[PDB]
Symmetry: C9
Subunit: 107 residues, 9 copies
Amino acid sequence: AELVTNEFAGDILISNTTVNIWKNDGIVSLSGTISIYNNRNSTNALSIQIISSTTNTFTALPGNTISYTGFDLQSVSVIDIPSDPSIYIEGRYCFQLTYCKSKRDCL
Amino acid sequence: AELVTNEFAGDILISNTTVNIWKNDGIVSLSGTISIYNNRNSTNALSIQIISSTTNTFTALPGNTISYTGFDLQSVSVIDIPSDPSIYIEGRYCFQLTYCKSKRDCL
Amino acid sequence: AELVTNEFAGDILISNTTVNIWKNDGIVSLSGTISIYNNRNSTNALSIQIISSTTNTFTALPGNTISYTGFDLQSVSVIDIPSDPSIYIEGRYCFQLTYCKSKRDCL
Amino acid sequence: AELVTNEFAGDILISNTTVNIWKNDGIVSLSGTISIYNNRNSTNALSIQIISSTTNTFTALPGNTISYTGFDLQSVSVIDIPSDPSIYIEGRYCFQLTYCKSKRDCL
Amino acid sequence: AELVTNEFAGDILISNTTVNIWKNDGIVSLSGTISIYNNRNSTNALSIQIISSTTNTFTALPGNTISYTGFDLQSVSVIDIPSDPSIYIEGRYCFQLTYCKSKRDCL
Amino acid sequence: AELVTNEFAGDILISNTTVNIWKNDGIVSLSGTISIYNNRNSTNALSIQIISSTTNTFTALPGNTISYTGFDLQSVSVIDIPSDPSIYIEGRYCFQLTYCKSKRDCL
Amino acid sequence: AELVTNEFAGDILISNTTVNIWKNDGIVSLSGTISIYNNRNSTNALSIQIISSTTNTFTALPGNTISYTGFDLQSVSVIDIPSDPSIYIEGRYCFQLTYCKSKRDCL
Amino acid sequence: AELVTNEFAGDILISNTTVNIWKNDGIVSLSGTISIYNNRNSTNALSIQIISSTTNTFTALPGNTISYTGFDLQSVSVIDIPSDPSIYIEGRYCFQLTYCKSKRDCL
Amino acid sequence: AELVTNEFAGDILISNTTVNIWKNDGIVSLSGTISIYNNRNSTNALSIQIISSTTNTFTALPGNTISYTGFDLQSVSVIDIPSDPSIYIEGRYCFQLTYCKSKRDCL
């Protein structure tokens, strides 16, 4: 076996609903770091649920990045989106995820 | 054997049909991450079907990236394209795919 | 033995004929990803035939990239080029190809 | 096993409360360096609590970066935020964290 | 032994003759990819002969890149250059060549 | 075990006190290089104490960088800061620190 | 032993003489690629002698690069420089040379 | 054990005294290259003493770089600084130093 | 043991004397490539002596780079500098040097 690391980023734009921004397949064991930035021009805090072996909730105020590092990462969702007609949340995420891949069944 | 990683990106432009944007050969076992961005200037949501050992459907609203990580990735298609004469969907995809390659039958 | 990866790109300009854009030597076993972009300024769809252990045909509409990943890649050709005197197709391709090379007969 | 290093940065904006800016999952053993910059345009000092096997408190004056290197890094928080209605603290953090990951349970 | 890869590019300017643009020494066993671009401002097609274990001839129309991947690469020549006093062919080549080198007779 | 290298930089701004700019946890054995620059616009010399297995004091005049390389690096402090109401010291530091990390207790 | 690769470039300016542009020490066994460009503003062809186990002569017309790949590379010289008072040859070379180096007599 | 390389640069500004610009701890065995540049705007030569297993003195005239490569590098100092009230020496140094670090006493 | 490669460059400015631009310590066995450029604005040729197991002399005319590759490189000097009051030689050197370093006496 060898470890494989994937590094990726993405955008969040919101302008009580849950929006899933990342998930695994329920099979892959993923460890690593998740970072979520909420832009300083956002009207509201960004509430994030990270599901691993535990459920953790974080709040990023406008202009702040939250970061989490752990094992068995399963999903990341934006939660508790307020029902404000003037809502504007601009954000960015970055992920560094590592899993293990077998080389036995190699073509 | 050794693992090989391919990293590639591409564009999506749509201006109920299914459009296949990526597929494998049905033989290669591919693991990795797929990211699909729908540009903020799009008129509609981008519906994506990812086929692996399971079929998953995702929806990217304008200005959002969806990401998926899994084993046995087989195809990615845009699905549920609406019959609107004013439709405009601009998007981008990024893939990090890893497979296993033998070194036995080497020239 | 070791695996070798070649990464290369090239241009397509057309302004029923078949144009071969890439082929192997018929000996090298090549696996990897092929991406074909058809520029948004093209007048027509780009029809592509990829020959491996199977023959696959793809169509890239103007502004779209098609991608394929597989084993035993042998050739890529533009096919079904229409007999229009006003035809303009501008495109680009990208390839990530991996083969296996012996180190026994080393100088 | 192999070591994995994650490198990440983020922003701090404050305009007695504690704000957690980074934490681990309580399982991952993280070693590395933490750097915290307080911008020269800040009105106040930035007080930082780093929790590892010990609790350390640091103060970054406006225009200064503090750095810490250690084992068993668990969390970083902004602490002792003053109750001033004219407070403005702009900062940045950088982290280089290394953990160990097994390759036994590899897919 | 170890494999060595050389990557190089060069220019072609023509403004029935054969022009050799690359050759080996007749001893080194070279495998890899050859790409030949003919610029869109060229007046004529670029005819290329690639000698390996077989002789292959390719034609690049103005604005097109041809690519070839194989073993035992020996030479590349421009062939069938027309006797036109107004001829202008501007082109570029790219090569990724791999050979094997012994470490027995090491100083 | 494997070696881990951390590379980091930071700013110094002073506008007899001791200011600690970096320290370890008292457990990690760190080897490497420390460089301290005092900007040419500074009014005074920058006095630096580097604690390792020995205590070394250095003085960087305005526009000069001092560098030190050694084992068992423990802390770096600015020392002997003069009581001048017109003092202005702008500086920068750079560190390349290497430690050893076990892979026995790997998750 | 290990292989070492050196990559270097240089300029040629001439404004029947032989000019040696590169040579080895007569001991080192060098394999690799030599590329010689003759600038499009040159008045004359650039004649190049490459000495290896064989002597090869090449001619680069203005605006062309010649390339050679082989073993036992010993020297490269400009040859057959014409006795023209208005001669102007501007050129560039690039070399990728690999040799083998022992690690037995290591300090 | 593994080798560690540190690469660093710094500035020299002088506007018979000895100024130590770099030293080791007297324990670390450092091998590598030292380069010292004296700027073309300097009024005087830069005299440099490099202490290793031997003491070497070098002189860099304005606009020249001196370089030295050796084992057991211990210190570099500017020496023989003239007592001229109009002296201006601007310089830069670059170091590539390699030492050996054990992995036995790893945390 | 492992091989270590140092890569460095420097400037030459002269505006019969010998100027040593590089030397080793007389202990380190250095192999590699030396390149010496003489700028096109120089009034005179640059004569270079390279000492290895043999003494070689080279002449770089204005606008030319000379290159040499060999074992047991010991020193490079500018030689035969003419006694002209209007002399101006601007040059640059580049070195890629490899030596062998033991890991037995590791701290």
